[PDB]
């Protein structure tokens, strides 16, 4: 057995890794986390619950401390018809007589948004409902993402810095050694493996396995071990962002969802926290400058509020060829990053950590096990990359240079067959990206249909079938929607009850 | 819309197609079936088909000499006299790792006895239902894609009787039955089938033609020139000999199929209500049909020359495309592999369910047709890989046949799977990645049963508290104990539904 893990870098990636290792292995692993002093709101997947449940944490403990909110999905607005929107929900499509509701909607639906017809979540979001009743009841242990069965109906918005601080307390309580210091040199042995990290004030910190959580820097994985970073700039050019913290005047405006609003040269997130929104404009500097993007952001969400400070960021978009090199594993932005259009950041960290426990090394290091880990991590990001490019290709707007350039930009290899297929009929389990990338079929279909990649006609089988069962299911969805919105409290109301 | 479907060939494939089309489309499709004038096993997911049709097993199973299947018993593939079960049961998961992984770490009792209730159910010859009909553990109109929980059993049946049953169902619902021989299959100037010319009923025309003519491939191969891809290079078994053996003692009836490794192939045992079907699948490169029949008889019915042996040649592989122009092959005409994992009915079911999903309009969209072909190809290719893994895992090396199995070429995707399997267990991300009727537990159960075992257990397990896993092993044993005491025998339950 190996004995010791050294994690370099804190934040979400570092403290998720530290807390998880201690939850998995307790006192059968030694963990040190080294982070520098020289260092906004985020969304998650519904599946982050597996992580928190694995640690033994309940949302009533941490969510309020972390300014938290509930996320029922993402509202996409202004990507195609001006002022139109639809939701991408944490909700699977129902299946009637062997065909999902999206297939039926093409045949017998009211061709308003697909999402209004097909998902309860649409109308919950329009009514701004919480996913729990005042008594805590939902409207609908140690496990991992692989144990996802039923689609859990919500995820979280939170201040990720507060979450990281919360997890640091947990991890340190469980025996993680916390060192605040700068790494001045990374030592290697004769095989090129990492032998230790040399710190300004704590000398050399050594261990069996090193975890690189140094973010875009990639201090270990790129700067030391020569890992090759593969940029996605050719297919996804957005390289910068500018963000604002906007206090909420009226509490009941709190949305139980993330919004992704297409802008002149990129898109804007709105992440509703308890008492404020975080807004961020993600853009390509080929088409707009930082000053212009700040101006557009401000005009949209906070006109006249020069008291509110903007924060500017540059992003490294892509993935490392391998995230595990020798005795070093990259987790978080050091490993890979895509723009947060589908809230994938925390998911990438979670899957990397859960798979690190699964592929944890013995004293005899195993190149076959390591290769399987590297393949899984590459598939994860590459699948998401393809899915994200389909957003830009499906968007129907062509009003600015950015949006015109989106139409004709290069695209991933596999995405041609998918676009070909999607002109004829809906994608399904067998024709979406075939390896685990955190999304299922309904997510691919929903973005296509919402944006406007629609099949030319409905599936011919449906013209031969009795439409009554499907029509009845559309009616059930409307009625269940009606009942749920009358019964549930608002997002703010519920959160306020648990503060 | 197209209007009419002509099915050429009866049997399981033809009548499953005929009945499903009428179930799916009722009076919005015209269907005609033209046909000329032992025992089989299924997957648990065949229930999606029967439920779609609206049939309850208590109607048809007794009429089809039926039995229940909890899985397959694999015997004598590796150490002489050793066996294990491949069940209709998923592995439990504790603290993020399945019971096979924990078994490697804190186990050694065979893998299948420790990990699956099914093992001891089979050893005790239990039925999966209590006499009141309750399951030990209606789908309406659903398909294979709607499989969620693992349903715990499948069927053994007389497939001729199932075809007969379905024929009655289909004809009652408006299917036109024509008993005659096809003399000529007509084609138009584009090479699309125009009609089938019969001896006594003239030309039977339609919009869509379904080839259910078996290994013949009368439409898809002989008429349309479809290319057939043989698997003989990786799966050389090309013939079978079968015998029906009446069962003397009712209580000997097993709730499972047996696959017994033989000198130059393997033998199936399929238990029906009053008899077993036994068949030796072999390669004629290694044993003659006369020798094969002698070995089968010595194994299951020595001195029973009153029982007639039936000899069969098999066409092993798949059509490159099962849908060409206005013709779709279903069953043996489309593809066939040896019945080592009971795939024959599943291949028919999937092809039919996907034909409904990919049903053509008058425009005959080629993208929709292309998609169907791709699904059908992956279905069989995945099963191809899984089956070759059986022969590669088998440890016996005692005859020319088994020695040849060790060094025979394999499909290219299998090398990686073998290299992984030497190190750790396969999982959802490393088995064959497209739908092929089997999930991760099936791949790992065959590996661990046959002997492709990781060098060492998953290192992470040595860092973890083993109590939860040991408690789950204990639950499995105790649940097994309770169930074998509570459940009736396979025969008893079946007697009770006749
Ligand atoms: N499949 C993931 C992510 C996801 C599902 N639906 C979504 C809607 C929006 C954003 C992410 C998602 C989950 O179940 O949690
Ligand atoms: N996956 C199929 C087939 C299957 C599962 N377990 C099996 C055991 C033996 C033979 C086939 C199977 C099913 O669930 O029904």
From Swiss-Prot, chain B:
Disulfide bonds: none annotated. The active site is at 69. Pfam families: Trp_halogenase. This is Tryptophan 5-halogenase PyrH. The lineage of its organism: Bacteria, Bacillati, Actinomycetota, Actinomycetes, Kitasatosporales. FAD binds at residues 10, 13, 36, 38, 41, 182, 332, 345. Involved in the biosynthesis of the antibiotic compound pyrroindomycin B. Catalyzes the chlorination of tryptophan (Trp) at C5 position to yield 5-chloro-L-tryptophan. It is also able to use bromide ions to generate monobrominated Trp, but the brominating activity is only about 75% of the chlorinating activity. Pathway: Antibiotic biosynthesis. Changing residue 43 to A: 20-fold decrease in catalytic efficiency. GO terms for biological process: antibiotic biosynthetic process.
């Amino acid at each position: 057995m190996i004995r010791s893990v050294v994690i370099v870098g804190g934040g979400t990636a570092g403290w998720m890794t530290a807390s998880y290792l201690k939850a998995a292995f307790d006192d059968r692993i030694d963990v040190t986390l080294v982070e520098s002093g020289n260092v906004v709101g985020e969304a998650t997947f519904s599946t982050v619950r597996h992580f928190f449940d694995y640690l033994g944490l309940d949302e009533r403990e941490w969510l309020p401390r972390c300014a938290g909110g509930y996320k029922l999905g993402i509202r996409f607005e202004n990507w195609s018809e001006p002022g139109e929107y639809f939701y991408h929900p944490f909700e699977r499509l129902r299946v009637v007589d062997g065909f999902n509701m999206a297939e039926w909607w093409l045949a017998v639906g009211d061709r308003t948004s697909f999402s209004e017809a097909c998902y309860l979540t649409h109308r919950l979001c329009e009514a701004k409902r919480a996913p729990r009743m005042l008594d805590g009841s939902l409207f609908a242990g140690r496990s991992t993402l692989a144990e996802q069965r039923a689609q859990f109906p919500y995820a979280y918005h939170f201040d990720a810095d507060e979450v990281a601080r919360y997890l640091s307390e947990y991890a340190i309580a469980r025996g993680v050694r916390h060192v605040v210091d700068d790494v001045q040199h990374v030592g290697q042995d004769e095989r090129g493996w990492i032998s230790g990290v040399h710190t300004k004030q704590h000398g050399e910190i050594s261990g069996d396995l090193f975890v690189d959580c140094t973010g875009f820097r990639g201090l270990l994985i790129n700067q030391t071990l020569g890992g090759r970073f593969q940029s996605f700039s050719d297919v996804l050019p957005n390289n910068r962002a500018v963000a604002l913290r906007v206090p909420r005047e009226n509490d009941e405006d709190m949305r139980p969802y993330t919004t992704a609003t297409a802008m002149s040269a990129g898109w804007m997130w709105t992440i509703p926290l308890f008492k404020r929104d975080g807004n961020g404009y993600v853009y390509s500097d080929e088409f707009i400058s930082p000053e212009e993007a700040e101006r557009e952001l401000r005009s949209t969400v906070a006109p006249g509020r020069d008291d509110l400070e903007a924060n500017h960021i540059q992003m490294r978009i892509g993935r490392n060829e391998r995230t595990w090199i020798n005795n070093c594993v990259a987790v978080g932005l050091s490993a890979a990053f895509v723009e947060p259009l589908e809230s994938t950041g925390i998911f990438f960290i979670q899957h990397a950590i859960e798979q690190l426990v699964k592929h944890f090394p013995g004293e005899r290091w195993d190149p076959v096990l390591i290769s399987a880990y590297n393949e899984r991590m590459a598939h994860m990001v590459d699948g998401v990359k393809e899915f994200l490019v389909l957003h830009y290709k499906g968007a129907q707007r062509e009003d600015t240079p950015y949006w015109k350039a989106a139409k004709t930009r290069a695209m991933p290899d596999g995405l041609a067959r998918k676009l070909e297929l999607s002109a004829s009929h809906l994608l399904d389990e067998q024709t979406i990206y075939p390896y685990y990338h955190g999304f299922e079929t309904y997510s691919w279909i929903t973005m296509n249909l919402g944006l406007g990649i629609v099949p030319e006609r409905p599936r011919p089988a449906l013209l031969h079938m009795d439409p009554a069962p499907a029509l009845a299911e559309f009616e059930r969805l409307r009625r269940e929607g009606d009942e749920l919105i009358a019964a549930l409290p608002s997002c703010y109301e519920y959160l306020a009850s648990i503060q």
